[PDB]
Design a protein around this ligand. Sequence first.
Ligand SMILES: Nc1ncnc2c1ncn2[C@@H]1O[C@H](COP(=O)(O)OP(=O)(O)NP(=O)(O)O)[C@@H](O)[C@H]1O
Ligand SMILES: COCC(=O)N1CCc2[nH]c3c(Cl)c(Cl)ccc3c2[C@@H]1C
Ligand SMILES: [Mg+2]
Ligand SMILES: [Mg+2]
Ligand SMILES: [Zn+2]
Length: 341
Amino acid sequence: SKLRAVLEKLKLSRDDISTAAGMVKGVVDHLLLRLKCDSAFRGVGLLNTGSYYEHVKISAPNEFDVMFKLEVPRIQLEEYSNTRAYYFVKPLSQFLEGEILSASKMLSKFRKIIKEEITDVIMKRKRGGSPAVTLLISEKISVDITLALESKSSWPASTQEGLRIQNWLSAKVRKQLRLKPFYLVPKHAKEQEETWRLSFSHIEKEILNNHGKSKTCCENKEEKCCRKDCLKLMKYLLEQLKERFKDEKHLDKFSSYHVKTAFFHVCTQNPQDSQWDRKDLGLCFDNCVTYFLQCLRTEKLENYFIPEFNLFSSNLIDKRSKEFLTKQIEYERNNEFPVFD
Ligand SMILES: Nc1ncnc2c1ncn2[C@@H]1O[C@H](COP(=O)(O)OP(=O)(O)NP(=O)(O)O)[C@@H](O)[C@H]1O
Ligand SMILES: COCC(=O)N1CCc2[nH]c3c(Cl)c(Cl)ccc3c2[C@@H]1C
Ligand SMILES: [Mg+2]
Ligand SMILES: [Mg+2]
Ligand SMILES: [Zn+2]
């Protein structure tokens, strides 16, 4: 089919994987070692996150996401201004502003050490908003390194009704996942440079790499579902539209995380592996496209872990920009996705 041919073109070359994985490893492992020399970052450890480690990276292995996490014992959080996702947190004294541990102070020292420690490896110009320090290896491979505080405490109350996976992955899996740590990354609330942001990237990876109702989903030829193929196609649809419309400000604020989040909700809506049969790829992809269009139309895209954090709030994305993306995605759906050609 046309969609199968798209998926074929989006496959990663084994040779590119071998080269890129080796280059990323050498840089990451080196910075890990060097940060451990600093009194503040002694305890950093690696967590691999994002689409490469979820096996949904498309086209080229040219962008990798990692967390350098630090266990902070005795963490005490205070939710910032009913935002549900942003928190105050109360060798680390250098980062205290009062009794709060300043996210911006920690991020600035983290960035400064990496910049000094960095194979042709450069640091990309600071992007506002992002919690990451971003590197570029050999002019081609981007690496986002996100500092994170690790907490082994119970997840914050704003997550109590999130992760609605009980009919898909099971109640016992939901309980096991909520016994894992959670993370705080230095992305600040709109106003607040002291605040941190909840992150569950590690749980997103666990879900995508163990994604079936059947434990043997995608382990044999009889159970090769099309979940990851549908996420890849949604990602490519948004990627291509953002490229075509790169000079149109209306597409600036959309990201692959909006389609990842919508995808997780469609998995909740369609929990059975038989709703993701390979033979139904076009229908499954359409289910994902129509769900995303409904999210745009209703201005509703809840964070999968934090339901009262709406990614499609008018506070974050103007109605006009969602309507613009609706228009372009409807055109694609109505014309058999010419942007894929
Ligand atoms: N807005 C967000 N809210 C929460 N977590 C986010 C957000 N944006 C990115 N992340 C996390 O950071 C990871 C890497 O971000 P990004 O590199 O932008 O996306 P990806 O999932 O890696 N897809 P891509 O790199 O586009 O193939 C995502 O997988 C999420 O786990
Ligand atoms: C092309 O890649 C960009 C990317 O990877 N990011 C930029 C935007 C963003 N926003 C985040 C939030 Cl809100 C949380 Cl909780 C955790 C991680 C992120 C990230 C990452 C570092
Ligand atoms: Mg990525
Ligand atoms: Mg990234
Ligand atoms: Zn599967």
